[PDB]
Amino acid sequence: GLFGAIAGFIENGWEGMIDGWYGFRHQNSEGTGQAADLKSTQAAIDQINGKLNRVIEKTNEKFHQIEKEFSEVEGRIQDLEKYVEDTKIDLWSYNAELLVALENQHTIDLTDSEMNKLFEKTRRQLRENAEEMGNGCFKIYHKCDNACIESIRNGTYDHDVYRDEALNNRFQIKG
Amino acid sequence: GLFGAIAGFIENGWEGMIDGWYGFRHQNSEGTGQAADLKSTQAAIDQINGKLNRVIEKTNEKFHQIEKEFSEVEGRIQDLEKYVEDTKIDLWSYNAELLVALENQHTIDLTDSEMNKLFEKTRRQLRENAEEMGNGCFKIYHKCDNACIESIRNGTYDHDVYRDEALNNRFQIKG
Amino acid sequence: GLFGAIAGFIENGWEGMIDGWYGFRHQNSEGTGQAADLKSTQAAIDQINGKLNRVIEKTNEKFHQIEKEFSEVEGRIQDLEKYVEDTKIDLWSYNAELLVALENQHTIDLTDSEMNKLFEKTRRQLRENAEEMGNGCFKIYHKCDNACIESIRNGTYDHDVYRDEALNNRFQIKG
Amino acid sequence: QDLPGNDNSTATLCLGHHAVPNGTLVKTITDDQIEVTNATELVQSSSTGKICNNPHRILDGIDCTLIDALLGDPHCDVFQNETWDLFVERSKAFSNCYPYDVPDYASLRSLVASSGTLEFITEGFTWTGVTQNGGSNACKRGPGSDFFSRLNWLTKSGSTYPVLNVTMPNNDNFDKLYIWGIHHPSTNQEQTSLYVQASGRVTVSTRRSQQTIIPNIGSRPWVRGLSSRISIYWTIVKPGDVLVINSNGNLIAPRGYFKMRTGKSSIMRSDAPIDTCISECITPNGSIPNDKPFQNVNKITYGACPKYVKQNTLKLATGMRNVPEKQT
Amino acid sequence: QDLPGNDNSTATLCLGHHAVPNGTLVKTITDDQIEVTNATELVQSSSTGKICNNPHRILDGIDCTLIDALLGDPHCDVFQNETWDLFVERSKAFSNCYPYDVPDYASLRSLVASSGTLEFITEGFTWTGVTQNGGSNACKRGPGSDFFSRLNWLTKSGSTYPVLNVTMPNNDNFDKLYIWGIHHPSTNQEQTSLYVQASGRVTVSTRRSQQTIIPNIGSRPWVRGLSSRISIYWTIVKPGDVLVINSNGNLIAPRGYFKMRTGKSSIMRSDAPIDTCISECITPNGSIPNDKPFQNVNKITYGACPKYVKQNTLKLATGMRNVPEKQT
Amino acid sequence: QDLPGNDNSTATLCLGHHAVPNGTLVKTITDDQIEVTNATELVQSSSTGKICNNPHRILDGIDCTLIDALLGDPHCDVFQNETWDLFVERSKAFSNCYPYDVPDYASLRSLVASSGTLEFITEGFTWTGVTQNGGSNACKRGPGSDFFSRLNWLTKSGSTYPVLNVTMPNNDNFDKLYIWGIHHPSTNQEQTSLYVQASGRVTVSTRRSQQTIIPNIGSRPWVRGLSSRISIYWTIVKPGDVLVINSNGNLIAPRGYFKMRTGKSSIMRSDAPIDTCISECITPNGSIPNDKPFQNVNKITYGACPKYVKQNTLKLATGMRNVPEKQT
Ligand SMILES: *[C@@H]1O[C@H](CO)[C@@H](O[C@@H]2O[C@H](CO)[C@@H](O[C@@H]3O[C@H](CO)[C@@H](O)[C@H](O)[C@@H]3O)[C@H](O)[C@H]2NC(C)=O)[C@H](O)[C@H]1NC(C)=O
Numbered sequence A, B, C: 001g002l003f004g005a006i007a008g009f010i011e012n013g014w015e016g017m018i019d020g021w022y023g024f025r026h027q028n029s030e031g032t033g034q035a036a037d038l039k040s041t042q043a044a045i046d047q048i049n050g051k052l053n054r055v056i057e058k059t060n061e062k063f064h065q066i067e068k069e070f071s072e073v074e075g076r077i078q079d080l081e082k083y084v085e086d087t088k089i090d091l092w093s094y095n096a097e098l099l100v101a102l103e104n105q106h107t108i109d110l111t112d113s114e115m116n117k118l119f120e121k122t123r124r125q126l127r128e129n130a131e132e133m134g135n136g137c138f139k140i141y142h143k144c145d146n147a148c149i150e151s152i153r154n155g156t157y158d159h160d161v162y163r164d165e166a167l168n169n170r171f172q173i174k175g
Numbered sequence D, E, F: 001q002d003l004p005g006n007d008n009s010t011a012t013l014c015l016g017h018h019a020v021p022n023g024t025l026v027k028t029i030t031d032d033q034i035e036v037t038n039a040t041e042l043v044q045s046s047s048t049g050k051i052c053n054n055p056h057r058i059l060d061g062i063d064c065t066l067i068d069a070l071l072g073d074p075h076c077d078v079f080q081n082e083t084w085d086l087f088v089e090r091s092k093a094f095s096n097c098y099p100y101d102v103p104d105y106a107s108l109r110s111l112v113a114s115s116g117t118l119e120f121i122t123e124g125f126t127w128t129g130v131t132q133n134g135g136s137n138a139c140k141r142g143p144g145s146d147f148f149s150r151l152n153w154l155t156k157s158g159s160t161y162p163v164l165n166v167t168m169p170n171n172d173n174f175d176k177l178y179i180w181g182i183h184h185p186s187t188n189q190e191q192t193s194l195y196v197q198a199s200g201r202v203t204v205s206t207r208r209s210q211q212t213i214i215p216n217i218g219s220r221p222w223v224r225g226l227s228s229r230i231s232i233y234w235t236i237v238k239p240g241d242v243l244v245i246n247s248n249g250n251l252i253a254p255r256g257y258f259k260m261r262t263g264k265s266s267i268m269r270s271d272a273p274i275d276t277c278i279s280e281c282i283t284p285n286g287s288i289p290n291d292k293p294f295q296n297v298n299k300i301t302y303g304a305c306p307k308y309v310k311q312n313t314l315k316l317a318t319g320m321r322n323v324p325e326k327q328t
C-alpha cells in the first residue's frame, strides 16, 4: 500500500503468528523465537472496528411507500413510478460500490501504516546500536540476550547501556 | 493518523504555541526558547482552506419545484410526490455524512503528514551532527548557540561547519 | 503530496527522462549518466490503470424511461416529471465531481508514495556507505564505477564489499 | 557506561505481520480482486421465507383483498373493525359478491392501507320513500341473498323513488371516510324496475368538494350471473364539515363511516407464511435480518430494513493484505 | 574547517505542534468522535423568521389565494394585473364570492404560480341572445351583488337561451390562458329559470383539444347562502390557434385572457412576515443565509439555497488533532 | 576482501521523476487546478449527429406519428404491422385524416411505443343493423373518401341504429390491445342523420373494467373541413377475459387487436439522420460513443449510455504531478 512495508520491504507475512497481527521474531545467544506485538495489533484492530461500526450504523426505516410491482398496463403514471424506483436503486448501488472501494483501499493503507510505524518505533529505540538490513530486520550490534530482546519489545531498551559495545564492533575497520 | 507524528512519536501538542501550528523548542548553552515554523503552518493552512472553499462552492438554485406538504388525502399521485422527495433527502443526507467523514479523515492525516515532513526536513539538514531521540527531539552533538539554532530553523544550517566537532563527541568511546 | 518526495525534497522533475516515470542520475569515476527505473514506473502505471478501468467499468443501459421534454403546459404530473429528472441529474453530477476529486487526490499521493518508496529502497541498500544530501541524492563514500552504479540500480549492490572503504573516508576526521 | 566486554556478538530482530492460509478477495479503488486476511459481507441476500409476526401487527388477509374486507364481502366478514401495521394480501384472494369496479382503486387501496383501521361506525341515515337493504343472489351471506355489509342498496318503494337529499355533519374532531357507490344497470328495463326514473344520478358533496356520477346502462360480461356493476367512490369529510348525499336513482348508500388515522401502516402482497418470531424488516419473500447495511432480497420492504442494492455480494476488508509463505 | 575548540557541549531541538484547551469533536471514517483544534458547521439550522423582500419580488397574498386573485373575488381586486417572483399564500386567506370548485385545482395553482403574471386582457366576446354580467348576493362587490371580475355569468333573456357559438383567434405570438366555467344549479327549477334548456352543455375547443362539461343538478351544502356551485376550467390557446366556445346553457364565460410567460416564479405557503432585507434563499420559516452547503431549516425552498439534509449539525474539521499537555 | 586502492573518491546518485513540458490541469480535494503529467476526459460531449442504425432496430417514422401509424392514417399505411427497438418521431410529422383527439394521448403513445409492435389481427366482429366502413372526405385514401385503416365507422342501417351488443373473447394466451373511439358530432342534425338516437353512448367492458363515454355535440374549429371530432380510447383484454362493446350510437368500432409484447422498445423525438453504422447509445442529437463514464450531450438516451451529467469536462489525472525544471 502507500507505505510499502506490508507486501513491500517486508517480503511476506507469517502464517505462524497466531497471537497477534504484527510482531517480532528474534535470533540471539539464548536461542530464537517470536512474539506478537499487542499495541500495534490493537491500533490496527480498533480502527477497523471503528469504520466497521460506522458502516453498520442506523438503518433507516420506511413504512408505506409507492408500489413497485404492477399487474396491469397503465402508461404514464406507472412509467414514472418505475423510473423513480429504478433511479433510486441505481443511486444506492453506486453508493454501496464506491463505499466498500474507498473503505477497502483505506484498510489496506492503514494496516500498511501500522506495520511501518512499528518498524520506525523500533528503529528509533535502537538508536546507534543496530542497522537496518532492509528486509524488516535490524542487526543489533552488541550481545542482546532474551531480556535485552524483551526490553526492545516492551519499549524499555536503554541504548546508552550498549552504545560503546555496539559502536565499537559496528565501526570495526578490518576485513 | 497515517504518519504517526501527531499523537504518535510526538507525545502531545503545545498549548503554549500561539504563533503557528508547527514549531521548534530548544535547549543550548545560552538557554531555552521556542519559535513557530511558518512554512509548514502555511502549507497545512492553505490545504485546509482549499478543501473548505471547494465544499463551500456554488449553491444550486431552484425555483418552482413540486409541493412538499399536503392537506388532503389523495392516494397514488401524492404517495409518489412524497416518495420522490423522501428519497431525494435521504440521498443528500448520505452524501453530506460521507463527505465530512472522508474530509475529516483526510484533514487529520494531512496535518499528521505536515508534522512528519517538518521532522524529516530538519532531520536531513542536521546530517551527521544530531541524533533522533525518538520523541520528536534531535540531540545536536556540537555547540549550537542561538544563531546556530536559528539557521536550522531558517534552513541555512551548514552541517560541514560542525561535522568534525559533532562526529568526535558523537563517537566518544569511553563510558 | 502526503509523502513530500515529488514537489518536495526532490526540487523538480526531469523533462529529460523519456524512458520511464522514476529513475536515477549519477556521477562516478567513469563519467555521468541517467537511467529510468522500470519497477517503480510499472507499480505507479499499473495502479493508475487499475483505477482507470474501474471508472470506465460497465455502463448501465436503460431503454423506455419517462419523457424529459414537454411541449404543452400541464401542471402537477409534469412538474413531478421534471423534478424527478432534475434531482437525478444533480445527484449524478455531484457523484462525478466528488469521484474525480477523490481519485485525483489519491493519484497524486500514490505517485508521491512510489517516488519516496524508491528513495527508501535505495537508501536501505546503500547501508553505511552513503549519506543523504537531502535533495534526493545520495553521496556514495567509496569508488563506484559504472558497474557499481548499475548494481545499485538493479538491486544487487553488496554493501559489505565497500563498507571499510566507505566508513573510512566517511569518518575522515581532519578538516 | 559499562566496562569493556570479553565477549562480542550480534543479534537479529525482525519485524513482520501475520498471514492466513485461507484469505478473501476484496475490491479496492485500484484493484478489483486483492486478497486480504479477512472481510465481512455487507449485502443480506436471503430470507427465512417467513414473515415474523413481531414486532409489527401483521394481519393476514387470507382470501380477502383489503378493498373487499372494507366493503364487506360476506366471506370477509371476519375483518370487520380489524386493525394492522401491515395488511398482507394473498395471491389466492378472491371476491364473491356483487360485481363492482373502483375507479382509482389504487388510491382507495392506498389510503385505507395507510390508515390501518377498518373501524366502522353506523350512522342513522334516514332514507324516506325508498326500500332499504336490497341484496343479491351473487352476494350470498349465509343461506340468503345479501350484499356488502357496509353499503345499503336502495330501490323503489311500491311505485316510486324520490329525490333523496340527506345530510350528515361531521361534528367530531376526526376525519370520516365515507364509501358509497352507484349501480349501473344492464338494461333500461332494469333501470326503471329498480329506480323508476330512466336516468339516475348521484351527487355527494361537502362544503369543499362534490362528485356527480351518472350511471351507465349496458350489458357487461356475466360475472356471478350478473351483467350489471356497481362502481365505488369515497368521500373524506373533515371535522366541522357536512356530507350531503342527493340522488334520484341508482344510489348505493353508505351505512356510516370508517374512521381514518395517521400511522405507520401499509399493505404488502406476499404469499409468505406468517410465523411466530421477531424480525423488524419484512420483505414479500419473508423477513430478513437487518444487521447488514444493504440487502439484495427484495426492493419492497416494510420496517427497519437494509437499503436494497443491485449487488449480491459486497465484502468489506476487515484485515490487512494477505501475503503468505508457501500458500497453504 | 574551523579550529579545535575548548568548550564541548550539545544542544536539544524538539519539533512539535500547537494544541488548544477548547477543541471540537468531529466524525471521521474510523472514529465518530475525535477531537480537533477547530471545525466549522456545514448545516444551517436557523432562520430569521422573516422573508426578506430582496432580491426576489415577493407578492404577499394577504387574505387572498392565488386562484381567488386570478378569478377576481371582490376582496382580491388589489391583485389585478399583479406580478411576482414568489407569491406567498397565507394560512388566513379566505374566499368570499360564489362557491366554486376547481377540478385539478393543484395544476391550475401551479401553472399560474409558475408564469408569475396575472396580466389580463379583455377581449370583445359578443354573446347574442343572453343576458351578460349576472352576479350574486354571495359575491358582493361593494354595496352590490356582483361576481368574479374575470368571468361573465350568462343567463337567458326572455325564454330563450340560444346556442352560443363564438370564436376568438390567437393572432398574437404568445399563448393565451382562458379561464371559464360551468354553473351547476341546485334544482331543475333553477336550471330552467336561468337557462331554459333542462340540460345545459359547455364545449370549449381549439384546433388541438376540446372539453365538454355537462352541469350537475343537485343540492350541495349551503355556503354563503347558496347550494349551487360553479366549476372552473382552463384552456391555453397557442399562437395561430382559435378558441371556440359553444354552449346552450350554464356557461360562465371568459372576459378575455391572462397572458402566460416562462420565468423563475413560484408560490409558497408561509405565514412568515415579509421584511426589508436582502437574502437569496427563502424558506416557509423565513429566509436563511446560504453560506453553508447544507441546511436543516426546511425542505421547501425558493432561490439560491443550501441542500436540505436530515442532519442538524455536520462539523468539518479545519485543524489538526488536539492532543493537549494536560487534558480536555 | 580486496587490496587497498590508491585512489580515494566518492560518487553521487540522485533519484528523481520525469516531467512533461505540456501538462494538464486537474481538480483535487484540496486544489481545483493542479498540474499533472497527463489526464483523461470522462465527459463525452459530442455526437456524430447521426443515429446509427445498429445494433438496435431503428424505425424512422418519416412524416408519421406513432399514434397515426397505429390508427392507420392513409399516409402512414407503410407502418402496418411494423416493429422497432426505437421509433423515431420527426418534428415534421403531420396527420391527415379525420380530426381526433386522444384523452391521455401520452399514455397510449407510451404503451404502444413500449411494446414495440404494430402487428394487427382482424377479428370477425359482426355489426348487425348498421352500415359499416363509413369514411370521410378529410381522410382520403387514394382517390377515395376513406378513414383510419384500423377503425370501423358505423352509421345506421336505413332507419334505425340498433343497440349494438357484441362480444369477443380472449382465448389466446397473450393480451390484446383494442383501440376504439366515439364520434362527437357538430350539430344535433348531424347526430340524428348518422345515428338516429339524439344521444349516443359507447360502453366497452371486460370482466374487470368498463368505460362509458357519451358523445359531445358542438362546433369545434374547422380542421380539414370538419368541426366534428372522434376521441380515441383503448382496452387491454387479458387471456381468458371477454371484450363486450355495447352502443346505441356514435361508436367508431375496432377491427380487431394489436398484440402487445414486453421488450426493450421505446420512442424518441429526433430529427437526426439515420445512418449506417454501429453505436449502442442513442441521443436525440445522434449517437455518441460510450467509452466515457459520463456524458453531457443530452439527458434523453436509449441503449448502453454514459450517465448524463451537468459538467462538460471532468479530467481524471492519470499521471503524477508535473514539476518542470525549466518549464519549456
Ligand atoms: C350482450 O352480449 C353479451 C355477450 O354477447 C351477453 O352475455 C351473455 O349472456 C348470456 C345470457 O345470460 C350468458 O349466459 C349464461 O352463461 C353461464 C355460463 O356459461 C351459463 O351457466 C348460464 O346458464 C347462461 O348460459 C353469458 O354468460 C353471457 N356472456 C358474457 C361473456 O357476458 C348478454 O346477454 C347480451 N345482453 C343483451 C341484453 O343482449
Ligand SMILES: *[C@@H]1O[C@H](CO)[C@@H](O[C@@H]2O[C@H](CO)[C@@H](O[C@@H]3O[C@H](CO)[C@@H](O)[C@H](O)[C@@H]3O)[C@H](O)[C@H]2NC(C)=O)[C@H](O)[C@H]1NC(C)=O
Binding pocket: D165, D166, D167, D242, D244, E219, E220, E221, E222
Ligand atoms: C337538501 O338538504 C340540505 C341538507 O339537509 C339542505 O340544506 C340546508 O338548507 C337550509 C334551508 O335553506 C339551510 O338553512 C339556512 O341555514 C343558514 C345557515 O345556518 C341560515 O343562515 C338560514 O337562516 C337557514 O337556516 C341550511 O343551512 C342548509 N344546510 C346545509 C348543511 O346545507 C337543503 O336545503 C336541502 N334542499 C332541498 C331542496 O331539499
Ligand SMILES: *[C@@H]1O[C@H](CO)[C@@H](O[C@@H]2O[C@H](CO)[C@@H](O[C@@H]3O[C@H](CO)[C@@H](O)[C@H](O)[C@@H]3O)[C@H](O)[C@H]2NC(C)=O)[C@H](O)[C@H]1NC(C)=O
Binding pocket: E165, E166, E167, E242, E244, F187, F219, F220, F221, F222
Ligand atoms: C360556430 O363557430 C365557428 C367559429 O365561429 C364556425 O366555424 C367556421 O365555419 C365556417 C363555415 O364553414 C368556416 O369557413 C370555411 O373556411 C375554410 C378556410 O378558410 C374554407 O375553405 C371553407 O370553404 C369555409 O369557408 C370557418 O373556417 C370556420 N372557422 C373556424 C375557426 O372554425 C362554425 O361554422 C360555427 N358553426 C355553427 C353551426 O354556427
Ligand SMILES: *[C@@H]1O[C@H](CO)[C@@H](O)[C@H](O)[C@H]1NC(C)=O
Binding pocket: A146, A147, A148, A150, A151, A154, A156
Ligand atoms: C521489559 O522487559 C524487561 C526484561 O525482561 C523487564 O525487566 C521489564 O520490567 C519490562 N518492562 C515492562 C514495562 O514491561
Ligand SMILES: *[C@@H]1O[C@H](CO)[C@@H](O)[C@H](O)[C@H]1NC(C)=O
Binding pocket: B146, B147, B148, B150, B151, B154, B156
Ligand atoms: C538564518 O539565520 C542566521 C542566524 O541568525 C542569519 O544570519 C541568516 O541570515 C538567516 N538566513 C535567512 C535566509 O533567514
Ligand SMILES: *[C@@H]1O[C@H](CO)[C@@H](O)[C@H](O)[C@H]1NC(C)=O
Binding pocket: C146, C147, C148, C150, C151, C154, C156
Ligand atoms: C546487476 O548489474 C551488475 C553490474 O553491471 C551485473 O553484473 C549484474 O549481473 C546485474 N544483475 C542483475 C540481476 O541485473
Ligand SMILES: *[C@@H]1O[C@H](CO)[C@@H](O)[C@H](O)[C@H]1NC(C)=O
Binding pocket: A052, D038, D039, D040, D318
Ligand atoms: C473477520 O472480521 C469480522 C468483522 O470484524 C469479525 O467478526 C471476524 O471475527 C473476523 N474474522 C477473524 C478470523 O478474525
Ligand SMILES: *[C@@H]1O[C@H](CO)[C@@H](O)[C@H](O)[C@H]1NC(C)=O
Binding pocket: D080, D081, D119, D120, D121
Ligand atoms: C365496530 O366498532 C364500533 C365502535 O365502538 C362499534 O360500535 C361496532 O359495533 C363494531 N362492530 C363490530 C362488528 O365489531
Ligand SMILES: *[C@@H]1O[C@H](CO)[C@@H](O)[C@H](O)[C@H]1NC(C)=O
Binding pocket: D045, D046, D047, D284, D285, D296, D297, D298
Ligand atoms: C424474492 O422474491 C422475488 C419475487 O417476489 C424473487 O424474484 C427474488 O429472487 C426473491 N429473492 C430471494 C433472495 O428470495
Ligand SMILES: *[C@@H]1O[C@H](CO)[C@@H](O)[C@H](O)[C@H]1NC(C)=O
Binding pocket: B052, E038, E039, E040, E318
Ligand atoms: C476555524 O476554522 C474556520 C474555517 O477555517 C475559521 O474561520 C476560524 O478562524 C478557525 N478558528 C480559529 C480559532 O482559527
Ligand SMILES: *[C@@H]1O[C@H](CO)[C@@H](O)[C@H](O)[C@H]1NC(C)=O
Binding pocket: E080, E081, E119, E120, E121
Ligand atoms: C391590465 O393590463 C392591461 C394591459 O395593458 C390593461 O389593458 C388593463 O386595463 C389593465 N387592467 C388593470 C385593472 O390594471
Ligand SMILES: *[C@@H]1O[C@H](CO)[C@@H](O)[C@H](O)[C@H]1NC(C)=O
Binding pocket: E045, E046, E047, E284, E285, E296, E297, E298
Ligand atoms: C420550519 O418550519 C417547519 C414547519 O413549516 C417546522 O416544523 C420546522 O421545525 C421549522 N424549523 C426551523 C429551524 O425553524
Ligand SMILES: *[C@@H]1O[C@H](CO)[C@@H](O)[C@H](O)[C@H]1NC(C)=O
Binding pocket: C052, F038, F039, F040, F318
Ligand atoms: C494519458 O493517460 C491515458 C489514460 O491512461 C493514456 O491513454 C495516454 O497514453 C496517457 N498519455 C501519455 C502521454 O502517456
Ligand SMILES: *[C@@H]1O[C@H](CO)[C@@H](O)[C@H](O)[C@H]1NC(C)=O
Binding pocket: F080, F081, F119, F120, F121
Ligand atoms: C399483419 O399480420 C397478421 C398476422 O399474420 C396478418 O394476418 C395480416 O394480414 C398482416 N397485415 C399486413 C398488412 O401485413
Ligand SMILES: *[C@@H]1O[C@H](CO)[C@@H](O)[C@H](O)[C@H]1NC(C)=O
Binding pocket: F045, F046, F047, F284, F285, F296, F297, F298
Ligand atoms: C443536443 O441537443 C439539444 C436539443 O435537443 C441541445 O440543446 C444540446 O445543446 C445538444 N448538445 C450537443 C452536444 O449537441
